[PDB]
């Protein structure tokens, strides 16, 4: 049989080049993609002022405003769905994730203007859900739409340029091309076969998009926490206990994630109507929310670069907890286009920057920075819902720049894993094509 | 279809004996890479306490500090031929075949042979690096182990394994990151599903990682300190000089290949015509060693100043030859030790010239000569050894530049791309085939 | 982030002078030093600029040392040193710090100013 | 070296009219920049990479060109515009300076 083998060997790394240029057309359109999507999101959040701003006397008079326009708009949002392409609800990755092992569709001439412009109102609306998903769903669509263009076909151009698209999606969202590159490999990759995806394209598509992004957002990046100390020996066991507590709670937020998420179906059986109010509803909730206590609302980002400073107290950080537990899954379990990617980052940071808090005064001996366990923890709750460990941590060391937490953050993110293993527990992301390509047959 | 779903439902789902072997592996990998490291110092240590004796009548030297390297290299290629023939080279297209059941892991044999013996080329100086010294050595650690409580099954096989080696990729170049990504992206058996798993080479790798912790602190193997950052104008110059690594990483494959024939006819097959021809390159080395230093020795010690820029442009250039032969006549010589690491710093020193031309070729982009050191630094890990993203990661693991990402990969890109449309093959499966095709016939 | 620049004034035909710039509100190094004068009504003519570790040093089309940049990120100072000076080098000098956005380099933010007059 | 050549030396016009300066290179340029000089003051980085204003320029003005020929422009220019303004390339070693352009308020 070594014969095959030594055949094979001799032929490694030789990807057809054609492919390998289109690699490079995915990964640029994701690129000019990525950003428009987020300059618009931006710009809509922006008039979401320019009109808070302009009511600013009469009090219930914003409190009305900021809940309409947060409304009108998630409704135009899950409109935008329901009516005209029902996959793009949700992260967007369990299906990309899906299309890779062919039992799900890539209906791109629906799904990129859906998502698109669906996003732009429930996230322009300031909901608790990020824009990252968003591209990365966008971006498999922007691959096969280039491969449906070109026809050229073979079950390695197919994959392979879908696979890019996505991971030059997940790239230009966080700036971050290697954890772009490590998701694919992961997470994406049909996990229980070999398969003719060529990594050697997706680094062209993620390099190129990456250079897009770049072009139109230099000098600024997405989390400023600056350099915090290092993590001494004695101070490591601290970070694996961290981990087995987002173990054993990694699972627990899939659950309710899941559930609320039928529970939520209840309230409109599947009408577009009760949905599309409900949405608003939610919607506008949120928006209201992003102005009496912003850190329960929005993408949640930009309360990270705080939280890990220890600006909050104690207690405020546990309201920012529950709250945000809350408003997360109400506006992911409803089906909303958006991603559930960014805020469990979040998430993280916060319950991460407790653990710190607590640790801080427990023992003063180890001289610890809150901080550093917030980075910990910041893609703990990524390695026991999404289960891909090394994609969360090196997607946090590529947009918080901290290498010198990088032994600690396996170490927590492994204890992640770990506990949300011997504890039932599964990718949330994997749960979900489940749950919706058992939902496609088993009916009928 | 009805099966993935019931697959899916229950991923990630690996056995806890596995696991808990996973964490012996890796910690005994650790205490050993420290071990093998420790020693090896110790040996580059009295090869001192030699010449500082004798600092006084110089061909006195220069002739101690010959036969110094000799003798040792030659204890070293002598405890190979004669007790584990596989050991010699770099350690991995063993582990990568052993990964595939082509190869075996005579670690009863391995270990004691490749550790001792590395001591002697490596201790006395010769141009090889002592990381993949530590893969292999940490394969046969974990089979050792795999063997030792019986545990049985193909997931128990090739995942202590692929830890014992992850965890050795790992304590080598304090680089836990790429010890990981390396199991995954070069030796994992590249062309089917394979039930290795990556929990298990994580919690191997952290463990050994902790162990060389202990006994490594306060000091890293690489400290440029932290260059300038790269503006997106100046981008297409690191395509550039991964073009350049591109075209010349196959090219540095045949050399290795073919001077390994050549060198054999030296001595047709025979443990004597073989050991003698050790010490004498290895005596070479070692003489080279104190006569110009740059040109001997790992390298790692002159990637720090490269890529400062203290050398003078045709310092490099010789510094870059000398190395380019140093290193094939070392490694394709058969002997214990890894071209992994003088890689590294070939490139680190091709990278610093292609800075040098670049800074005075446009003033205007305002750049600084390191920066491509550290491009290029990966860059023939990823057109010889053809593996950019053990390559990439394996740099910013230990040089801390991660504002050097988008070029690092650029470079890295750019630098296989070439080395396919140009023939090429990854160097480390190559000898695999070599050696695996030499078996049978 | 202030840029002070002293040093300037009245030096006779042949002279030398040490003009000296003061840097304060942010990290001096990872910084590109350069200066710039403006001569009495007539525009601005680059002098020289003096990268972080000072490994590179560049002036414009002027001989041997008429300038001569350093600096000492110990003091966070900027130094430039004219030798046998001549009316020309009568001008308003300017010591800016540099910055770039694509890549094609600028002058940031300018620094106070300083005065040589050559006369005597 | 490029010699960067402002157009008119010296203008005026009225607030709220809108004024556009040229800058012509010898040769070729590509991401222009401009500083503002206020009587009294070192200058003031505006526009750069032909059109990116900087943090606090109002978004009156706006920068365009194109290798050989770039402009900078005042959509209703205002009083505190009255300044000279300096473009500025180093597109091409070593960099150079315009010859400026003296803004005059009518009023």
């Known amino acids: 049989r070594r014969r095959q083998l030594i055949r094979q060997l001799l032929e490694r790394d030789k990807t057809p080049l054609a492919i390998l240029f289109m690699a490079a057309v995915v990964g640029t359109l994701v690129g000019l993609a990525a950003v428009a999507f987020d300059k618009g999101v931006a710009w809509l959040q922006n008039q979401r002022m320019g009109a808070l701003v302009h009511t600013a006397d009469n009090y219930p008079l914003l409190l009305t405003v900021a809940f309409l326009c947060s409304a009108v708009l998630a409704m135009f949002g899950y409109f935008l769905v329901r009516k005209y392409a029902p996959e793009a609800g949700g992260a967007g990755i369990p299906e990309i994730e899906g299309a890779l092992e062919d039992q799900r569709p890539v209906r791109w001439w629906r799904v990129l203007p859906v998502k698109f412009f669906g996003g732009l109102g429930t996230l322009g609306g300031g909901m608790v859900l990020g824009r990252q998903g968003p591209t990365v769903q966008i971006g498999g669509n922007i691959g096969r739409m280039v491969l449906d263009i070109f026809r050229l076909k073979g079950d390695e151009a197919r994959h392979t340029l879908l696979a890019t698209g996505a991971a030059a999606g997940l790239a230009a969202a966080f700036n971050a091309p290697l954890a772009g590159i490590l998701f694919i490999i992961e997470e994406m990759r049909p996990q229980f076969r070999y398969t003719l995806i060529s990594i050697k394209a997706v680094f062209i598509g993620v390099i190129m998009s990456t250079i897009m992004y770049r072009i139109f957002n230099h000098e600024v990046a997405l989390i400023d926490v600056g350099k915090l100390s290092d993590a001494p020996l004695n101070t490591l066991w601290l970070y694996l206990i961290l981990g087995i507590i987002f173990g054993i709670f990694g699972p627990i937020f899939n659950k309710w994630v899941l559930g609320m998420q039928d529970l939520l179906h209840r309230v409109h059986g599947g009408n577009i109507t009760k949905w599309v109010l409900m949405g608003g509803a939610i919607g506008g909730l949120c928006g209201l929310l992003g102005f009496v206590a912003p850190a329960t609302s929005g993408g949640g980002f930009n309360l990270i670069p705080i939280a890990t400073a220890g600006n909050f107290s104690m207690g405020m950080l546990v309201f920012i907890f529950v709250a945000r537990v809350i408003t997360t899954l109400l506006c992911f379990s409803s089906g909303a286009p958006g991603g559930i990617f960014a805020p469990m980052l979040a998430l993280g940071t916060v319950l991460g920057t407790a653990f710190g808090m607590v640790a801080v005064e427990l023992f003063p001996q180890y001289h610890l920075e809150a901080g550093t366990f917030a980075i910990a923890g910041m893609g703990a709750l990524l390695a026991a819902s999404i289960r891909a460990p090394l994609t969360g941590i090196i997607l946090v060391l590529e947009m918080t720049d901290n290498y010198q937490l990088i032994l600690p953050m396996i170490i927590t993110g492994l204890g992640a894993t770990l506990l949300a293993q011997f504890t039932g527990g599964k990718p949330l992301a994997s749960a979900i094509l489940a749950r919706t390509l058992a939902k496609q047959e088993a009916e009928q | 279809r009805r099966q993935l779903i019931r697959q899916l439902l229950e991923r990630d789902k690996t056995p806890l004996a596995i696991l808990f072997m996973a964490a012996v592996v890796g910690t005994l990998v650790g205490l050993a890479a420290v071990a093998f490291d420790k020693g090896v110092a110790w040996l580059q240590n009295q090869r001192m306490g030699a010449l500082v004796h004798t600092a006084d009548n110089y061909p006195l030297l220069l002739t101690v500090a010959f036969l110094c390297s000799a003798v040792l290299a030659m204890f070293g290629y002598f405890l190979v031929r004669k007790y584990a023939p596989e050991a010699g080279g770099a350690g991995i297209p063993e582990i990568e075949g052993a990964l595939e059941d082509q190869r075996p892991v005579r670690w009863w044999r391995v270990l004691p042979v490749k550790f001792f013996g590395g001591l002697g080329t490596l201790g006395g100086g010769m141009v090889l690096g002592r990381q993949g010294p530590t893969v292999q050595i940490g394969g046969n650690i974990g089979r050792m182990v795999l063997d030792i409580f019986r545990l049985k099954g193909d997931e128990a096989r090739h995942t202590l394994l692929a830890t014992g080696a992850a965890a050795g990729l790992a304590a080598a170049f304090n680089a836990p990151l790429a010890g990981i990504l390396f199991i995954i992206e070069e030796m994992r058996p590249q062309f089917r599903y394979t039930l290795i798993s990556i929990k298990a080479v994580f919690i191997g790798v952290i463990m050994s990682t902790i162990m060389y912790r202990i006994f490594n602190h306060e000091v890293a193997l690489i400290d440029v300190g932290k260059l300038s950052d790269a503006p997106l104008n100046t981008l297409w110059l690191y395509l550039i000089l991964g073009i350049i690594f591109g075209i010349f990483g196959p090219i540095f494959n045949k050399w290795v290949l073919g001077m390994q024939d050549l060198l054999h006819r030296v001595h047709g097959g025979n443990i004597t015509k073989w050991v003698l021809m050790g010490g004498a390159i290895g005596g070479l080395c070692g003489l080279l060693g104190f006569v110009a230093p740059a040109t001997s020795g790992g390298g790692f010690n002159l990637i720090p100043i490269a890529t400062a820029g203290n050398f003078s442009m045709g310092m490099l250039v010789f510094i870059f030859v000398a190395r380019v032969i140093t290193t094939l006549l070392c490694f394709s010589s058969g002997a214990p030790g890894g071209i992994f690491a003088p890689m590294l710093a070939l490139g680190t020193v091709l990278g610093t010239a292609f800075g040098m031309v670049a800074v005075e070729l446009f003033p205007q982009y305002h750049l600084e000569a390191g920066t491509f050191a550290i491009a290029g630094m990966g860059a023939l890990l990823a057109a010889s050894i053809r593996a950019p993203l053990t390559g990439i990661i394996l740099v910013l693991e230990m040089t801390d530049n991660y504002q050097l990402i988008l070029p690092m990969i650029i470079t890295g890109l750019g630098a296989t791309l070439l080395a396919q449309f140009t023939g090429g093959k990854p160097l480390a499966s190559a000898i695999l085939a070599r050696t695996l095709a030499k078996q049978e016939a | 982030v202030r840029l002070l620049e002293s040093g300037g004034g009245l030096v006779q035909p042949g002279g030398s002078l040490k003009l000296s710039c003061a840097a304060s509100g942010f990290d001096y190094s990872r910084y590109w030093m350069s200066w710039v004068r403006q001569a009495p009504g007539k525009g601005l003519k680059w002098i020289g600029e003096i990268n972080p570790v000072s490994s590179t040093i560049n002036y414009t089309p002027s001989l041997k040392d008429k300038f001569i940049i350093s600096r000492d990120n110990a003091k966070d100072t900027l130094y430039l040193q004219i030798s046998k000076v001549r009316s020309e080098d009568t001008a308003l000098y300017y010591c800016?710090?540099?910055?770039?956005?694509?890549?094609?380099?600028?002058?940031?933010?300018w620094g106070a100013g300083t005065t040589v007059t050559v006369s005597s | 070296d490029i010699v960067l050549t402002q157009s008119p030396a010296i203008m005026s016009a009225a607030p709220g009219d809108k004024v556009t300066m040229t800058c012509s290179a010898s040769?070729?340029?590509?991401?222009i920049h401009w500083y503002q000089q206020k009587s009294g003051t070192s200058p003031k980085r505006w526009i750069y990479?032909?059109?990116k204003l900087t943090s606090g320029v109002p978004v009156r003005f706006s920068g365009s060109g194109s290798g050989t020929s770039y402009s900078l422009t005042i959509n209703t220019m205002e009083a505190e515009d009255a300044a000279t303004y300096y473009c500025?390339?180093?597109?091409?070693?070593?960099?150079?300076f315009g010859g400026g352009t003296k803004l005059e308020i009518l009023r």
């Open positions: 500025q390339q180093w597109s091409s070693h070593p960099q150079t």
């Open positions: 800016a710090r540099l910055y770039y956005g694509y890549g094609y380099w600028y002058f940031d933010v």
């Open positions: 040769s070729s340029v590509s991401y």
């Open positions: 990479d032909t059109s």
